[PDB]
Amino acid sequence: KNYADDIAHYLKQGKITKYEEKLGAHPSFSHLKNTNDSEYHYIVSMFVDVRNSTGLFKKFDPDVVANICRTIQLATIHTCWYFDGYVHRLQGDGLMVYFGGKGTTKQKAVDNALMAASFISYFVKNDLKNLFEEQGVSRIYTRIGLDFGDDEDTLWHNAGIGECSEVTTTSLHTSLACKMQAQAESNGVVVGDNILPYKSSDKNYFTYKKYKKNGSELPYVYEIPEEYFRYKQHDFNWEKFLKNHPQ
Amino acid sequence: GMEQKLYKNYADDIAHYLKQGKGQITKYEEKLGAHPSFSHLKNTNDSEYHYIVSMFVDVRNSTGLFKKFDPDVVANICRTIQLATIHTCWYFDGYVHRLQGDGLMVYFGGKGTTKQKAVDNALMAASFISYFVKNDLKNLFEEQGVSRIYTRIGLDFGDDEDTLWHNAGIGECSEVTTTSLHTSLACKMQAQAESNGVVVGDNILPYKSSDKNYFTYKKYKKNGSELPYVYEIPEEYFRYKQHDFNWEKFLKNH
C-alpha cells in the first residue's frame, strides 16, 4: 500500500532485504570474477518489463517520472527479495532476476519465481488500478518472461573487461526467458516448457501459447529439429495461482 | 579509415569459434551503472540535470547460435563481439553504463565534454560498431549454418533540463542512471533501425549541419502501422522525428 500511496501522490504532481547484494554478481558464482573459470549450473531466469512508462513524460516532469518508476522498481525488487530472488541487472524499464542457486532446490527456485511473478503482476495490475488512467496518461503494465535451464544448458562465466564486466549466464533458456517476456499479455507472465514439470504440468495454471512474430504465428519459441527440440511457451494464470493457494 | 583494419583479430576469433560446432588507464576502472560525472549520487536522494547522448546497441540473431553451438562457444562468440564494442566505445570516450546479454547501453558526454564532441563521438562509435558487424563478420555465420547476426543502434541527445541523473534501486542493488525522454527514445529508436542500421532523434541533427547527406527522416512503425513522430506532446507543440543515419557514407566522407 505504501508504494501505491507514494505513486498516487506522485501522480498528483502534474506539470526481507538484501542491501549488500551487488548487481552482476550472483552470490553462488561471484567467485568467478577476476578468474578465467566457469561452471554449469541450473537457474530460473526471469525478465520483468515495465511498459508505457515513457508516456509519463507527456504529463509529468522528469523528477516525478523518476519517483514513479523507481517506486515501481523498488516494489519489484522487494517482491523478488521476499522470494529469495537475486536481482542481477536493473533496466530503465525492468529487471533481470535469477532464482535458484547452490543452496536451493530446482522446485523451490521455480515456486519462488512463480510467486514473485504473480505478486509483481498483482501490484502493477491491481494495487495501481486506474491511477494512471485517472491522470490522463497511458496505463503502465508489466510483462514477465520465465524459463528454467538445467545444469548442462546453463553456463556461468565472466563477461566484459575490467570493471565493465559481470558474472552472468550464457544459456538458451535465459535468452528464451527474455524472448517470452516480449510475448506476455498485459500484466501477464509467459513461461517455457521446462517450468511445467515443476508444477505437475497443470493446465490449471498454464495454457499453451503460440509464438507471435511480426503479425504471424509459429508453434514454438525455439526449434532444433536435429535434436527433436520444439520448445513451447505458455501463458501462466497467476491470478488463479494466487487464489488457489493456502497462503 | 581506422575501422578497415581495427577488428581483424575479433573477426578471426569469431571465425575460429564458428568452426567449433557440436583509450585511457582508468576506463578499465569504470564500473557499470556509475557514470564518472555522476557516480557520487549513489546511496543518496540527490539528483542533477545534465545533458547526455544515450546510445542503445542491440545484437540480433545471436540466440540462433544455440542451434549449432554449445554454451561455451556461444559465450566466446558473443563476448568477442562485446569486447570489440566496448573497445570501440572507449576509443570514442563513451561510458559503458549497462551490459545486456545481447547488447550495451552507452552514454556519450559528461561534465568535461562539449555537447558537440559528445554527438561526434557517438556517431563515430555507432558507425564503427555497425561497420564491424556488417562488413568484418559478413558471411561468417552463414558459412557455419547459423542465421546472420546484425546490430541495431538507437541514438538520442538530451539537453540539461530534460536529463535527470539520479540513483535507482537500493543499497548495492542500485545504479546511477538517467530519467529522460531522450534515453527512453534512444531505446525505442533502436527497435526502429534496419539491419546493421542506426536511428537518431531530432536533437542529433543540428550537431551535424542537419545534413540530408547522412540523415533520412523515417516514420515510426507500431503494430504494422506508421506514425509521423516517435513522440508527440501536442500541448507543447512537441513533434519528435526519427531519422536513419547513413553511417557508411559518414565513414566514406572522413
Residue numbers in the entry:
A (entry chain A): 7 to 21, 69 to 300
B (entry chain B): 0 to 21, 67 to 298
Which sentences from the paper describe this structure?
3’,5’-cyclic uridine monophosphate (cUMP) and 3’,5’-cyclic cytidine monophosphate (cCMP) have been established as bacterial second messengers in the phage defense system, named pyrimidine cyclase system for anti-phage resistance (Pycsar). Until 2021, scientists reported that a group of bacterial nucleotide cyclases, which utilize UTP, and CTP to synthesize cUMP and cCMP, defend against bacteriophage infection, proving that cUMP, and cCMP are authentic second messengers controlling anti-phage defense in prokaryotes. In this study, we aimed to structurally, and functionally characterize both cUMP- and cCMP-synthesizing PycC and cUMP receptor PycTIR.
Among the discovered pyrimidine cyclases, only clade E PycC cyclase can synthesize cCMP products. The native crystals of EaPycC that belongs to space group of I23 were subsequently obtained, which contains two EaPycC molecules in the asymmetric unit. The structure of EaPycC was solved by molecular replacement and refined to 2.2-Å resolution. Each EaPycC molecule has a central seven-stranded β-sheet wrapped around three main α-helices. EaPycC assembles into a head-to-tail homodimer with two symmetric active sites at the dimer interface. However, unlike BcPycC, the N-terminal α helix (α1) of EaPycC packs against α4 and α5 helices in the same protomer instead of extending into the opposing protomer. The active site of EaPycC contains two conserved catalytic residues D102 and D146 responsible for divalent metal coordination, which superimposed well with those in PaPycC and BcPycC. In contrast to the UTP-recognition residues, Y50, D94, and R97, identified in BcPycC, EaPycC contains strikingly different specificity-determining residues, F100, R142, and Q144, for CTP binding. Indeed, mutating F100, R142, and Q144 to alanine residues abolished the cytidylate cyclase activity of EaPycC, yielding no cCMP products (LC-MS dataset).
